Amino acid sequence: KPRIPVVWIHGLECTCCTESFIRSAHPLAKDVILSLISLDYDDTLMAAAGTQAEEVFEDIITQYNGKYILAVEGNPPLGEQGMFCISSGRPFIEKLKRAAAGASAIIAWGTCASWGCVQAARPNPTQATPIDKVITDKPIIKVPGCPPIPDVMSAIITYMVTFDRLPDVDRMGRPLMFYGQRIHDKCYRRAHFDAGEFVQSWDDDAARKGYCLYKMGCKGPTTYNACSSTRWNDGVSFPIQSGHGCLGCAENGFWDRGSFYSR
Amino acid sequence: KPRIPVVWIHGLECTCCTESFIRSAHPLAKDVILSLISLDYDDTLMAAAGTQAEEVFEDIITQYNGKYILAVEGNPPLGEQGMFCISSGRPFIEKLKRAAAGASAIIAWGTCASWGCVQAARPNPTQATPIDKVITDKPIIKVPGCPPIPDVMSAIITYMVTFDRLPDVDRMGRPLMFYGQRIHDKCYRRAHFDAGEFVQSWDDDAARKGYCLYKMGCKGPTTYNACSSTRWNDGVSFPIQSGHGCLGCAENGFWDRGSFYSR
Amino acid sequence: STQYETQGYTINNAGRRLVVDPITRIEGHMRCEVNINDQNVITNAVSCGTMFRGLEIILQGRDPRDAWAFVERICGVCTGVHALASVYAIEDAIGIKVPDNANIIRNIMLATLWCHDHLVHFYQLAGMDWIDVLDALKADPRKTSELAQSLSSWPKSSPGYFFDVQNRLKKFVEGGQLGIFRNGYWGHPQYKLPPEANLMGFAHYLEALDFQREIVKIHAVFGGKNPHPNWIVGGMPCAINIDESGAVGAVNMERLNLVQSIITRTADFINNVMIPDALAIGQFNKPWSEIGTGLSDKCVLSYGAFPDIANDFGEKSLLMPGGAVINGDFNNVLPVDLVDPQQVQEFVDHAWYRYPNDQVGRHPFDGITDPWYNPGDVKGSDTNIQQLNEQERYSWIKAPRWRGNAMEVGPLARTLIAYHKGDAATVESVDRMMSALNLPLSGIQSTLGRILCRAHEAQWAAGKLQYFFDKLMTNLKNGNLATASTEKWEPATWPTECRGVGFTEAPRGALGHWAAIRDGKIDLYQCVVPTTWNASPRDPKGQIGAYEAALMNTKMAIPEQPLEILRTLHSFDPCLACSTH
Amino acid sequence: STQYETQGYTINNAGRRLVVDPITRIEGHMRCEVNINDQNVITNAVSCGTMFRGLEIILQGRDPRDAWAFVERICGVCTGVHALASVYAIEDAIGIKVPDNANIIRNIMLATLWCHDHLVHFYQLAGMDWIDVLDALKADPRKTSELAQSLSSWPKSSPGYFFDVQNRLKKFVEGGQLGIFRNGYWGHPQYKLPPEANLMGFAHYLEALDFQREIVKIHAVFGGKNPHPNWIVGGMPCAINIDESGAVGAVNMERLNLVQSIITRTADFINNVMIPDALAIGQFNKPWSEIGTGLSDKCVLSYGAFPDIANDFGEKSLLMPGGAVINGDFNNVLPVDLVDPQQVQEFVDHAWYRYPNDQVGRHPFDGITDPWYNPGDVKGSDTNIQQLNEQERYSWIKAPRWRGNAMEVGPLARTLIAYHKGDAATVESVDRMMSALNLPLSGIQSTLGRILCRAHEAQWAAGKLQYFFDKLMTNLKNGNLATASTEKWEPATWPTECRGVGFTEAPRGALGHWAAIRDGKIDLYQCVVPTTWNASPRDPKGQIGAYEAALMNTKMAIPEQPLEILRTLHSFDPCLACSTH
Numbered sequence A, B: 001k002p003r004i005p006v007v008w009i010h011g012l013e014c015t016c017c018t019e020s021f022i023r024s025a026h027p028l029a030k031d032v033i034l035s036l037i038s039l040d041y042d043d044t045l046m047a048a049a050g051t052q053a054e055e056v057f058e059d060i061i062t063q064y065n066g067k068y069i070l071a072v073e074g075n076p077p078l079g080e081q082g083m084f085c086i087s088s089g090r091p092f093i094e095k096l097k098r099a100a101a102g103a104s105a106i107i108a109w110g111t112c113a114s115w116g117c118v119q120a121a122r123p124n125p126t127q128a129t130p131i132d133k134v135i136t137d138k139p140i141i142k143v144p145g146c147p148p149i150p151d152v153m154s155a156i157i158t159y160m161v162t163f164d165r166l167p168d169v170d171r172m173g174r175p176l177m178f179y180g181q182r183i184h185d186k187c188y189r190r191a192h193f194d195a196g197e198f199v200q201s202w203d204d205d206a207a208r209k210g211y212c213l214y215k216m217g218c219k220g221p222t223t224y225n226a227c228s229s230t231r232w233n234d235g236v237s238f239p240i241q242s243g244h245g246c247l248g249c250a251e252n253g254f255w256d257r258g259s260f261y262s263r
Numbered sequence C, D: 001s002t003q004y005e006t007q008g009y010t011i012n013n014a015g016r017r018l019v020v021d022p023i024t025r026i027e028g029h030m031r032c033e034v035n036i037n038d039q040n041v042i043t044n045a046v047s048c049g050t051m052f053r054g055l056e057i058i059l060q061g062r063d064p065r066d067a068w069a070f071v072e073r074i075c076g077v078c079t080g081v082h083a084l085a086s087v088y089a090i091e092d093a094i095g096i097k098v099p100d101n102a103n104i105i106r107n108i109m110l111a112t113l114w115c116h117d118h119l120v121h122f123y124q125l126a127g128m129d130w131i132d133v134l135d136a137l138k139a140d141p142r143k144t145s146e147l148a149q150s151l152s153s154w155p156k157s158s159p160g161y162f163f164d165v166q167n168r169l170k171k172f173v174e175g176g177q178l179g180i181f182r183n184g185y186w187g188h189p190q191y192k193l194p195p196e197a198n199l200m201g202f203a204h205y206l207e208a209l210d211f212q213r214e215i216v217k218i219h220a221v222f223g224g225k226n227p228h229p230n231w232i233v234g235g236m237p238c239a240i241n242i243d244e245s246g247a248v249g250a251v252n253m254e255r256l257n258l259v260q261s262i263i264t265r266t267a268d269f270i271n272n273v274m275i276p277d278a279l280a281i282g283q284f285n286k287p288w289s290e291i292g293t294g295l296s297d298k299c300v301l302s303y304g305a306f307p308d309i310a311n312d313f314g315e316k317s318l319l320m321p322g323g324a325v326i327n328g329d330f331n332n333v334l335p336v337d338l339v340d341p342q343q344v345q346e347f348v349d350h351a352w353y354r355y356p357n358d359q360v361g362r363h364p365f366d367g368i369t370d371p372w373y374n375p376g377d378v379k380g381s382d383t384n385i386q387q388l389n390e391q392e393r394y395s396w397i398k399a400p401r402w403r404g405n406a407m408e409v410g411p412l413a414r415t416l417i418a419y420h421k422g423d424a425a426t427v428e429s430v431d432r433m434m435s436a437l438n439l440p441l442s443g444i445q446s447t448l449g450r451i452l453c454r455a456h457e458a459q460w461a462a463g464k465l466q467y468f469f470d471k472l473m474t475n476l477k478n479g480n481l482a483t484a485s486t487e488k489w490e491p492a493t494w495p496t497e498c499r500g501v502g503f504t505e506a507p508r509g510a511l512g513h514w515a516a517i518r519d520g521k522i523d524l525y526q527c528v529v530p531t532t533w534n535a536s537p538r539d540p541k542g543q544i545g546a547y548e549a550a551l552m553n554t555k556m557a558i559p560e561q562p563l564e565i566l567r568t569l570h571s572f573d574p575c576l577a578c579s580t581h
């Protein structure tokens, strides 16, 4: 049977969302690409460059008008007439709008496309702007995190292909399945939090026993993500399990909510 | 250079401890066997049977007298003159004592060898008896659980070979590294416990949200093990994560502490 | 010495007595004794379970809802199957129907076990009876590659790979620490593989040891852990949440993805490693298609398993057929009823138990487990057995019979039953497999046949895994998430007095749990387990069980080296903890 | 049109103009323009970073302890390397020494990144420039097996395997949904692999895509997650507990076991898949040992990396040598000092930034990041560039120089530096590698050479992984567990005013972070990143950077199909997000 067309574009970004995607353990990114979707455009992985790449882009969005999913990594800058991010000699934002116009739905990968992420942190030199502030007439699924969990990314994809619909979302457009609860609502150190058992300086006795990282600045209490349950890299770890507090990296504006090491 | 000789014997058992050992993800049981130890006797895996197996047993405990580690799975029954478990036409307990006498140290695998496990539950028809009540003049490391976690078993082995010493133990002879804390001290559902958010009947809304299993009988609060941190089967799950309360399976007499579904 | 005739055999205990105690590369504890004549042919075979724990006693007075957890620890090898039989039995007693997804997940747990158990048995338990491990040191790596590549599409076949495996084995043995290979039967004339096939098989032994750990991840997802996953009366505790808040606390799309990944790799390993190895062993050991027939051409039994219609245990539902054949009449597959007191019975005249009348058999609803260690007139003493006395009590295993008939259970039994009831997939698979070996159908009724059917079943179960997963996903797509029925969870809702039967097909054969509930507590709990059948001692008519029959009439090249005995016994996959419970 | 001479090149912008925008199979956003003469030879090359975010601006006013987390997001491909440079820089400023285990773990994090980044670059980014994926459909599976087995002991080589891979690709393309292969350069005359080597390479592409995910589990253990692991100023937060209560809450023996398992498999994959594939590409593409030399025979730079003596960044400590060569004088490897205002400077006369005087270069401690989009007289408009004007400002990338010299950085640079400082392992390795291809040493100074050195480095780093792990375990055996120094964690302990430099060798080359702290906050933070060097625009003397130089003088078979340009650019592993930050 035909596989669902996906167009994956890139604005201002670090490429952490593409890298996360290819870490998928189940399904493997290999099998996603070969069997689950048609990844028809993707700057980081595709053979075609330059005019060949433009031809793929134009052909796909024309031929599958109204039928492709648009995945967006990174975000459009509004500064300098959009020429802080240039694609084919024009503002990235023009490519975003053209791609958005033909999509059935959009996936905003990561805190970049969802919220703004690091380039939108004070003082936001480029006027980096999240996708939903620019595209206002399309379903946008926000999949935040810097980056999101690999197996969350692949799970959302498999959900859309298997069930042939978008995940249900909270009021902010995040899939309930993985963003419905807080890190702190499923954190294996909560026993210590409840007991007032806290790491107070790095590598103290409390740290060597896996005590709670709240006094070290953990932002788990205000952060919605699946890290403390699903975990990272095939269930191997997550920030808190490896001894560092949650930064808040799935939440809007997390860079500017004060030092990572303060309350 | 020579690998450390290990003699692995079996009393009354279900073989869950051998099966757990071979599930090891890192190191693989294969590499443990080929490279880390010399598994010189083991009924479940060894080529030799009958008189050939007796010859291996006698040769190993003679040639490496004072130099081998004895691993014990299962336990001796004292009933019917010990002939509830017969090896080479004699009571298993005689084989246990002979093996113990030449060992440098003993590992009591599982709740069977550590405490008694299911055959020692009321009314203990066979007078199944844990190893430390029979062998009283040797270092015994208790590694309880029914069975213990695969990667805990392999970790204890790698510790002994790498560091050339026994793990430090609590007052019950359990390695501090993995049995120093309770399931409930590192359970990812503690947030729910602390908030009074409990499953009340199977597959209710609370269950579908991963609420705490205390009211369904979970014995995590009184059970020392690594299941809620290290988890099972290469970090894939543990009892509570898959929706069933802890049975208490690492604790002495857990079968006779009342219904698994009561407090 | 005495001689009598039973089931076409002449049981004669004159001549040299051989003892194999312990039997290794089985689960649990077994003793085997034979007599051989001057031609080194077995004229008498004695099967003795050398352990007992007493789960049926321990279960009395417990909560029925807790039963599954106790009986699961009957066995860590067939881990889960007793839990399944238990929840089936309690549900049957109380009158509980589980939701479809619970049923499907249970079928997944059982299919996972079949795959895992059959695979590990083939390589780690039986394999060294067929593969001469030390002979692999003589193989040519390139010829090994060429052989492997002629048999299979499996990627891992390079000369350098076989050289590395060979070098690993060489370094292992070079210090004289041979471990599990020490004092084996290497070089015995019944080892018939060329060195290249020994190196191919040994490589696969190591690959299987690695890979098996992955299969049970399906058990970890739905059941928390392996060994010894968790279950509930009323369904399964692994609540499902696909598309709602808190899915991180349940079986969600990422968890199901993990399960799918394991299913695919499991099928691939079985189909491309185990299946071709099973056929290769067949190819080099065709005489063993005529050794160890035992009861397999006379009497075979299946209860059936894998109900595809939730809560329906009838013929139209069970994907693995049930039925009984007696008297070598494979044209009359007979229906089995586990409530009928005239069908399944256990005798203890030759076992270490007390009955009011040891000359009759008791249906498990009338079962009694009153241990009585009484070996009578042994050579030696009651704490130092040199020779069991098989004219008296000689085992911790009860003697089950079906309508008074001694039956074989397990993969070969099931295959025969399914074949002769006309199951299309079974017929096609068996015909293909026997065609490939240029052997008649009858070649399957043998020690070699038991191993071939076990491989067939691993492939069958891997295919069924995908089928069940697909059915689960179909339900989820339709908004059907339920995993538990709790309307009758509370004791107050149960009948004051009720009884039930839970049955399935464990890896080793037909499994039944018979439970009686009274006043909220277990009144009686009786287990009849596959190895109880196969390893059975004799009955009041002197009839022999499947192990004793299969060992009868067997040639031994070297009496002091019991390779032929090990081959036949191992081919049944003995689980002695199961047998005795 | 104009012509001038620089660094032995004749820069001539007469003739046909070619534009490649976007450059794909890189990290981030790049535009390349060339002019070709009547022989289709490149006479002008223009390197343009088409993105900017402004991390150096964002970092002002932040806590120094938080800096690593912001700058890590300069790049998700070389994820971690900026965090490392950051903690190095802050520690250097404040005067912090970390415990040995922190240093070792940091070295492990960097070595892990080298292995991962080099591997994925080789297959997923550069690979399809050398492997004709569609031509793999023509390969013979058996010949493929034979080729693979002649090159490597890697297990996965069976004809059936190559057939299955080929059939997968066949079914993928059959329906016309070619995905990442759509509208590629397949069939271009510069594709020189035989079909069997294309199928071998494509199979390895898929194997590498799978396997790369495993390497970063090391980052997950010590750093919580990948991409973008966590770090601290003062060491690492992954506290160690081996033999005490609560080891479940720390890096314990089971966690270290996982790490060891990943190291072994990583080394095995690199040594037996990537290394032979790199040599095979060399074998079939020997002319590319003479294409794309650029600055690699004139000017190369390494800062050095992997300090083996904790807190010592000197020559005797760094396992990866630092040094500079200028003017093609490889007999005089020069010392590098990152504090010397006369050494590292950045120019912006040809970049979209404001300086008080754009005719001078600023050392990063005097650096300025004041964005100024001013493309001047382009063909088109400010929002529709048809042709950059390389006589004025044409990039978001600053132009770094070392003592006024345009330098190449990265694996080839490091290899040349180590080689010519007389590092025994490097000399032996390079000599053997060039010997095997029957090429002179000079063949390494090339597009093909950059790819060969990258493979060499992946092998080197995999070896170093084990070395560092062994050093960690040695400390743990001696009871040395410390992972963090917190004496100067609190701002109140810091100098009111201080500054520092953190430097390392990222996968793509020499990396420096220059940080100035005042009153507990970042006063200035300036980054000069490897691709900033390599993708550099021109300076006031018109000198060209590594990309422009390497593209110069290159023949194109088909102007409209820029395969030669992609090959040379990809050989440097461009990271444009890094370049611009």
Ligand code: SF4
Pocket: A183, A184, A187, A188, A189, A190, A191, A193, A211, A212, A213, A214, A218, A219, A220, A221, A240, A245, A246
């Ligand atoms: S470590 Fe963070 S998320 Fe976990 S219990 Fe403490 S504050 Fe909450």
Ligand code: SF4
Pocket: B183, B184, B187, B188, B189, B190, B191, B193, B211, B212, B213, B214, B218, B219, B220, B221, B240, B245, B246
């Ligand atoms: S599920 Fe059990 S161990 Fe976890 S918080 Fe609740 S009672 Fe404690």
Ligand code: FCO
Pocket: C075, C078, C081, C082, C506, C507, C508, C509, C511, C529, C530, C531, C532, C574, C575, C578, C579
């Ligand atoms: N299979 C299995 Fe175990 C036995 N015999 C059970 O039931």
Ligand code: FCO
Pocket: D075, D078, D081, D082, D506, D507, D508, D509, D511, D529, D530, D531, D532, D574, D575, D578, D579
């Ligand atoms: N490697 C890498 Fe990224 C670049 N260029 C850095 O530093």
Ligand code: SF3
Pocket: A013, A014, A015, A016, A017, A018, A073, A074, A109, A110, A111, A112, A113, A117, A118, A145, A146, A147, D073, D076
């Ligand atoms: Fe994930 S591209 Fe990396 S920065 Fe934070 S999401 Fe963006």
Ligand code: SF3
Pocket: B013, B014, B015, B016, B017, B018, B073, B074, B109, B110, B111, B112, B113, B117, B118, B145, B146, B147, B148, C073, C076
């Ligand atoms: Fe683990 S052999 Fe299985 S019963 Fe509980 S430990 Fe015993």
Ligand code: F3S
Pocket: A145, A146, A183, A223, A224, A225, A227, A228, A238, A239, A240, A245, A246, A247, A248, A249, A250, D225
């Ligand atoms: S930092 Fe991000 S990765 Fe998870 S634990 Fe916190 S939301």
Ligand code: F3S
Pocket: B145, B146, B183, B223, B224, B225, B227, B238, B239, B240, B245, B246, B247, B248, B249, B250, C225
């Ligand atoms: S039942 Fe046992 S396996 Fe762990 S979660 Fe409880 S100690």
Ligand SMILES: [Cl-]
Pocket: A008, A009, A010, A011, A043, A087
């Ligand atoms: Cl794009």
Ligand SMILES: [Cl-]
Pocket: A111, A115, A116, A117, A118, A120, A251, A252, A253, A254, A255
């Ligand atoms: Cl944000």
Ligand SMILES: [Cl-]
Pocket: B008, B009, B010, B011, B043, B087
């Ligand atoms: Cl034993």
Ligand SMILES: [Cl-]
Pocket: B111, B115, B116, B117, B118, B120, B251, B252, B253, B254, B255
């Ligand atoms: Cl106990």
Ligand SMILES: [Mg+2]
Pocket: C056, C398, C526, C527, C528, C529, C581
């Ligand atoms: Mg029974």
Ligand SMILES: [Mg+2]
Pocket: D056, D398, D526, D527, D528, D529, D581
């Ligand atoms: Mg800079």
Ligand code: NI
Pocket: C027, C074, C075, C076, C077, C078, C079, C575, C576, C577, C578
């Ligand atoms: Ni069993």
Ligand code: NI
Pocket: D027, D074, D075, D076, D077, D078, D079, D575, D576, D577, D578
């Ligand atoms: Ni980068």
